[PDB]
Amino acid sequence: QLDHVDIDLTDKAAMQDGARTFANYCMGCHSAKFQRYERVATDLGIPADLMMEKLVFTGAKIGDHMDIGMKPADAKTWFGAAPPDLTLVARVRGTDWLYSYLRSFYEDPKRPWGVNNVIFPNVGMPNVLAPLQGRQVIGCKQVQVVEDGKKQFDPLTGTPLTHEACDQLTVVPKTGELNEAQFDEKVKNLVTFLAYSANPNKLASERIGTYVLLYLAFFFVFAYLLKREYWK
């Protein structure tokens, strides 16, 4: 069961925060090698000098690909699975899958890295966002009551009516920098940046396609008139 996330690719600030998160917490193991720092800066509105100073940690040039020092074979040996390139991961898995996966890490001592994932069971990825999210466990917490889709909110306060469930992802209090909403926004910005990276032509594609479709409607009007006429 995935969680929906409304990802706005026109939000430059969100994509910038996601790019910062990716450059700091993610490029240690994951590459974005099909994507250049120069294009990322141009599309996110980041000045080239700012991109160089803040997001390029590997000594690469602005026009270089987002390569990392960790080789896939070395990382496969170390983690048991190679950390895949994340340029297209939004297209491979979708944004909802990524949003649910990055928020579904929970402590699991039976696992090599002490964590497991609800979305990706027995994943070989360590919980690298634990400092932000905090300790997440499969414990008992309050969940909104639902009966055959009969979802109960509080009529007055508008907040959910909850009952205890004992197989839920609960963040241990005072264990991470960000609360649930702040970590939700962090993961949303990261997934927004990943969605941009997978499909950097989306906005331009929509604009060009709108113009193309307008032209094709015009041309269809003319071709239809030239057909129905001349068929008399």
Partner: peptide
């Protein structure tokens, strides 16, 4: 605004 948004996570304390 962008610079603050893009600040690297790792902070290093340096002599002087």
């Amino acid at each position: 605004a962008i610079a603050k948004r893009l600040e690297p996570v790792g902070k290093v304390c340096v002599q002087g």
